[PDB]
Design a binder for this molecule. Sequence first.
Ligand code: COA
Ligand code: COA
Ligand code: COA
Ligand code: 0FX
Ligand code: 0FX
Ligand code: 0FX
Ligand code: CL
Lengths: 187, 188, 189
Amino acid sequence: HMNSFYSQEELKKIGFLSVGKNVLISKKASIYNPGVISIGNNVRIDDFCILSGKVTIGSYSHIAAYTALYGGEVGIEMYDFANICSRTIVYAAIDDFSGNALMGPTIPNQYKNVKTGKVILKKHVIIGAHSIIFPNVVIGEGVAVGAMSMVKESLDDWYIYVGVPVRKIKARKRKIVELENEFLKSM
Amino acid sequence: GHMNSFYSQEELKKIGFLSVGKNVLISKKASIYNPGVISIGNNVRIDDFCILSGKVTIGSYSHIAAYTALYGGEVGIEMYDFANICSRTIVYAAIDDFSGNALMGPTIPNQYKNVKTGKVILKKHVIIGAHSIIFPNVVIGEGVAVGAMSMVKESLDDWYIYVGVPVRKIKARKRKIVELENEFLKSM
Amino acid sequence: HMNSFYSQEELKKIGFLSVGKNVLISKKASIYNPGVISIGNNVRIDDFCILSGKVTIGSYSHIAAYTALYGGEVGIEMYDFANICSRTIVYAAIDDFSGNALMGPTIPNQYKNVKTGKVILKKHVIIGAHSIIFPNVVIGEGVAVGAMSMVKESLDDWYIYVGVPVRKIKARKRKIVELENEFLKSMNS
Ligand SMILES: *SCCNC(=O)CCNC(=O)[C@H](O)C(C)(C)COP(=O)(O)OP(=O)(O)OC[C@H]1O[C@@H](n2cnc3c(N)ncnc32)[C@H](O)[C@@H]1OP(=O)(O)O
Ligand SMILES: *SCCNC(=O)CCNC(=O)[C@H](O)C(C)(C)COP(=O)(O)OP(=O)(O)OC[C@H]1O[C@@H](n2cnc3c(N)ncnc32)[C@H](O)[C@@H]1OP(=O)(O)O
Ligand SMILES: *SCCNC(=O)CCNC(=O)[C@H](O)C(C)(C)COP(=O)(O)OP(=O)(O)OC[C@H]1O[C@@H](n2cnc3c(N)ncnc32)[C@H](O)[C@@H]1OP(=O)(O)O
Ligand SMILES: Cc1cn([C@H]2C[C@H](O)[C@@H](COP(=O)(O)OP(=O)(O)O[C@H]3O[C@H](C)[C@@H](N)[C@H](O)[C@H]3O)O2)c(=O)[nH]c1=O
Ligand SMILES: Cc1cn([C@H]2C[C@H](O)[C@@H](COP(=O)(O)OP(=O)(O)O[C@H]3O[C@H](C)[C@@H](N)[C@H](O)[C@H]3O)O2)c(=O)[nH]c1=O
Ligand SMILES: Cc1cn([C@H]2C[C@H](O)[C@@H](COP(=O)(O)OP(=O)(O)O[C@H]3O[C@H](C)[C@@H](N)[C@H](O)[C@H]3O)O2)c(=O)[nH]c1=O
Ligand SMILES: [Cl-]
């Protein structure tokens, strides 16, 4: 009732492709295929998350509770200082909604029409709570997506976007760049 | 436990479903309440952190993705074959009156509430997009797709795509899947 | 496959600052720092709930499944007959989104700009499913917010609000206060 994280010792036994230091991962998260999951330094992953398939997270990243990263074979990668608020989903693959294909894991591949492509969250990206990131997009450096937003296309750097699907509403301030440098120097 | 969280077939048998078919993959991390009123057909996968509570009937060739709640209550939620539900969806067969005419929820005796109930049926080939909510007494017509983050309070016409809160019809669903279903069952 | 609630024996082992009678808490919920968590009578908290930090719940309240109450230091408080539909998040603190500050628990405080403020849900508040309430917000007595709502500012009493962010759409009926009084009167005589 203080925390649910793995000890450093249990972390080493998971079998991650790579795992940094100061990594706090909830025992109530699910991790599938850990040998294609890579995690940098100073990363917290909270209860009821799902990481499945190829996922790469850098350093100084919080993946908050309920967040699903479905990396599949193509991968999701997050750069340093990116953070995801609770209940986000990032899909690297999704079925065709149009009616031109059967759907999902109970059906053989030949009848489906999966949209897939690597998803990247660049440095300083923040994803607002209850958001969905669809496949084959890059969320630009310093981009903020508001809560309950839906993204289907790559997003231009250093803007804040809101809505379903998102629209640009204003520039993201770049003082965090200054602070990153100040912070890193301080160490 | 880093490959999958599903029950073995011998484990499923011990849950005590009204009926459960073959090639059924149900996460040990999902919750299942009143399994004696739940039935599940063949080739079904239900993922981590789902909840199925009360009367839920699922056919064959269906994925209920992670975090989905199917609150069937006493009236029931029914999905037909080839229906699927994306992550984080909720389907309610019963909900409390929000007007201010009634008290609300499970801590309150029934005489003070005014629960709206009605079966929710998803017909063949329905797909429900992620983070959606379906409310009681709604028939989601054959082949309907509902987009992500959509809210459905009324029945939806067959073979159309709907989006928004609450949903609006935006374009017809293609029906190539009907051929595909036939070609796939014919392969078997 | 009947229910996931802690027995009364298990509950007493949790360590709440205060917990009342007829408290039904899912063992599949997460409770962090129960020492600052107070719960009244006739409360139900479902599977995959998270309660973390300073949370005070009154009586006749259902916290439905997936709901997360991040009370932090400043606290989240719910008055009696308040209820929260599934998959809501209530934040008593959040990071600055603007780009003026670094973010999240991996960064020291001096580089962040956290907004914080007590969040209060008054009597008879209902929060629709899949909603978010932000910090420093008082949800007025009898307020309903609809499904998928986002609330960043305090809400005036006895109205229904919907949308992201919410707008006031209609009055909420007050018959519920007459029912509260009827209900409580029957418990007494
Ligand atoms: S990690 C903990 C989780 N934190 C969060 O999820 C925080 C998310 N914050 C937000 O979604 C904010 O609302 C942001 C995106 C930061 C915008 O806040 P601002 O204060 O910068 O802007 P306004 O509130 O003035 O709104 C600007 C226009 O955008 C609409 N809008 C704001 N937020 C959203 C969301 N999330 N979804 C849809 N629309 C949103 C406002 O209605 C406003 O629209 P106009 O058309 O200009 O009125
Ligand atoms: S099972 C794993 C999870 N998969 C999903 O949740 C997939 C959900 N897919 C979608 O929500 C798509 O956006 C769908 C519904 C398939 C629509 O995509 P289309 O490519 O057919 O259409 P457009 O992107 O051109 O959009 C048409 C109009 O509808 C608005 N819109 C699209 N999607 C939504 C949602 N989910 N919610 C509200 N509105 C939505 C677009 O803004 C566009 O609007 P106009 O007003 O016509 O410009
Ligand atoms: S605890 C179990 C979970 N229960 C719930 O989440 C129930 C939530 N209920 C709702 O969200 C209802 O839609 C409420 C808010 C009670 C409104 O229902 P009403 O029947 O009173 O109102 P209408 O359907 O006539 O809608 C009024 C206007 O509001 C728009 N709207 C309704 N609901 C929403 C939500 N959730 N989000 C955004 N907008 C919403 C309708 O489109 C309508 O708009 P107009 O511009 O007036 O047409
Ligand atoms: C959400 C969640 C929390 N926890 C545990 C570990 C966390 O350290 C603890 C608190 O997490 P939280 O997200 O509720 O709060 P945090 O946002 O970490 O903030 C906390 O630490 C800060 C440095 C202080 N400034 C805050 O006042 C204190 O609330 O609970 C888990 O173990 N798993 C979880 O999923
Ligand atoms: C989401 C989830 C996943 N898992 C386990 C079992 C799954 O078989 C495995 C991966 O599931 P997933 O949803 O991440 O991915 P799937 O949609 O099953 O897809 C995967 O298999 C396919 C046949 C291949 N075509 C894909 O490239 C590979 O990603 O993880 C669970 O045990 N429980 C879960 O809730
Ligand atoms: C959502 C959830 C349910 N459960 C268990 C406990 C509950 O008694 C049971 C059913 O809960 P539910 O939320 O599906 O349904 P309820 O809203 O409790 O409704 C039901 O029970 C009432 C006493 C009756 N008055 C109703 O007619 C019957 O449908 O499942 C859990 O143990 N944990 C959970 O998170
Ligand atoms: Cl969730």
